[PDB]
Amino acid sequence: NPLIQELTQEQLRTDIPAFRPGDTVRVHAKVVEGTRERIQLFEGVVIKRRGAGISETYTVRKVSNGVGVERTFPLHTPRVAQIEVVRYGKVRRAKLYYLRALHGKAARIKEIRR
Template sequence: MIKKAKYKINLINSIEQKYIKKNIPTIEIGDTVKIKKLIQEGNKERIQASEGVVIAKNNSQINQTITVRKTVQNIGVEKIYLLHSPQIINIEITKKSKVRRSKLYYLRNRSGKSTRLKPKLI
């Protein structure tokens, strides 16, 4: 029974290794990222870029996700991106911020200047 379970896990991991991207930068909570995503409209494809602050991160091998928050016309918009998705073309870190929490959900209740994060001095 145990050998079958280990075999299934090894089989799944070996299949997933083919689809894991190698060129993803190390993204941390509080980083401002610019994500270029491939969007299909009918039979045409185009690249759409979106920029925002990473407020949450979920590390789970191929299912690694980040939650990005940005404000559009004074309305907060959050989107969850699957990092190893074939639709994501490029991820660029534009700014790093100093944070002391692993999830920045408190930014949902704030607006304006109070949503600013302290820049990280490298």
């Protein structure tokens, strides 16, 4: 463990804001359309986070044009530029897998100040 952490230490990002599963987030991804570079945005609710080290990932749920979409990211990629927390949610567990079988108003998460 400590030989691996030392090698991988110099590649962890330091500008990562704190968030939990349940919060809403805007990810500033990076797309390459031929030679062009460009930035998209992907707005949704964080539903997963499974971790320990450079190997940390999270996933975001969204509903686009009547179909639900999920996108998982590593925490430390340089191919993301920004993670912004928009709201805070009141939640009671770590994996919000029950959201993937609800729609509209049943899938509502209450807000909370922090």
